[PDB]
Amino acid sequence: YALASAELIDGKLRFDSSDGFARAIADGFFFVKSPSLDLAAGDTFARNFYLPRQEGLGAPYQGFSQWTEDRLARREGYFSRDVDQVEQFFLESRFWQTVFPGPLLRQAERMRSFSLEVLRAVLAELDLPVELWDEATGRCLSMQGTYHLTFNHFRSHVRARGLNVHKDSGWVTILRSLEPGLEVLREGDWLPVSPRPGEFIVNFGCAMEILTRHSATPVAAVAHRVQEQLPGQADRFSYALFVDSSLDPRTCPGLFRYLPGHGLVLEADFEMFLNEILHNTYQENTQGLYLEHH
Ligand SMILES: C[C@@H](CCO)[C@@H]1NC(=O)[C@H](CC(C)(C)O)NC1=O
Ligand SMILES: O=C(O)CCC(=O)C(=O)O
Ligand SMILES: [Fe+3]
């Protein structure tokens, strides 16, 4: 099975098959053509952030193990996992200017703009009235949301799963990758997904699934994982722009569900939801999934 694919053209997702969008929201995953988007700075960071900083050209992209939660905020910065191959760097948008080199800041901003264009184009196809969009998606459309550029370095010397089964937490994720390894759950079976040059992989997160579950057009967020990587040639990396609701509780009170004819119902505390699913992603015998309520 091949995922649907689209081009973003003036706020409109044009899929390359008549059933493309229908398949995308059933599959939880689809491809989108990259606009003119230089990826060199992110690729450099993805190959260097975990290395010790040494004098030279690579130095500004190295040594980021020094950026931990105490210098940023909870859930931010560098993490080495015990029972996953990934070592990771998470960074929310409010820290990008302080922490990222200039070229990576600019790439992050361009990926953020593109990701929100993708989100608006998806919402435009759903039975969700525009007057509710800003509140319903956690104020991320008015630039008060939670935007991470997050990097995965798959340490092939670690004998463990590559990245545990999980759902992403938020609205859309725009994923930059080069190699096989991603598998998505489809009709009860694990489907390998390979990246495509000049394209990003897009997927929906839990917030999208919760918002639309009881609407006329429900959208799936689907479980996915990365296979254990074995040694030999460059380590696998990936990185992605994750779009999430605001984490400030006076800006966004949590995750909503839309009930047509009634309005938005506040279903879940988002920070609690996020803290739980994040922790469960990286333990030995749990998974990054959630139990649907009601
Ligand atoms: C909100 C933020 C996570 C918390 O900081 C964001 N959401 C996600 O779902 C993933 C988490 C992952 C699957 C990599 O564990 N990545 C992110 O950057
Ligand atoms: O590395 C990949 O292909 C997937 C990464 C992923 O799912 C994530 O970071 O949430
Ligand atoms: Fe993911």
Residue numbers in the entry: 7 to 300
Give sentences copied directly from the paper behind this entry.
Here we report the mechanism of three Fe(II)/α-ketoglutarate-dependent dioxygenases in bicyclomycin synthesis, which depicts the natural tactic to sequentially hydroxylate specific C−H bonds of similar substrates (cyclodipeptides). Three αKGDs (BcmE/BcmC/BcmG) catalyze site- and stereo-selective hydroxylation of inert C−H bonds in BCM’s (bicyclomycin) cyclic dipeptide scaffold, one of the simplest peptide derivatives without additional functional groups. Our hypothesis posits distinct regulatory mechanisms: BcmE employs steric hindrance, BcmC relies on inherent reactivity, while BcmG utilizes a directing group to control C–H hydroxylation. Although these three enzymes share only 35–42% amino acid identities, the overall structures are similar, and r.m.s.d. values are 0.70 Å (SsBcmE vs SsBcmC), 1.07 Å (SsBcmE vs PaBcmG) and 0.87 Å (SsBcmC vs PaBcmG), respectively.
Except for solving the quaternary complex of PaBcmG•FeII•αKG•3, we did not get the other two complex structures using SsBcmE and SsBcmC. The DKP ring interacts with F248 via π-π stacking, while its two carbonyl groups form hydrogen bonds with T156 and S175, respectively. The 7-OH of 3 forms water-mediated hydrogen bonds with H154 and R81, whereas the 2’-OH group forms a hydrogen bond with the phenolic hydroxyl group of Y288 which couples with the amine group of Q94. Furthermore, the C-3’ is closer to the iron center, which is consistent with the result that BcmG catalyzed the C-3’ hydroxylation. Likewise, the comparison between PaBcmG•FeII•αKG and PaBcmG•FeII•αKG•3 structures revealed that the C-terminal helix may function as a gate or lid for the active pocket, and the binding of substrate triggers the closure of this gate. Our results suggest that the interactions between PaBcmG residues and substrate 3 control the substrate to be in a specific orientation for hydroxylation, which effectively reverses its inherent site selectivity. Combined with the crystal structure analyzes, we speculated that the hydrogen bonding interactions medicated by R281, Q94, H154, T156, S175 and Y288 and the hydrophobic interactions mediated by F96, F248, L280 and L284 stabilize and orient the substrate 3 in a suitable conformation to favor the C-3’ hydroxylation. Moreover, the hydrogen bonding interactions between Y288 (also interact with Q94) and 2’-OH drives C-3’ in substrate 3 to adopt a catalytically active conformation for hydroxylation. Collectively, we speculate that BcmG performs exquisite control over the site selectivity and stereoselectivity mainly through the directed guidance mediated by the hydrogen bond between Y288 and the 2’-OH of 3, similar to a directing group control strategy in chemical catalysis.
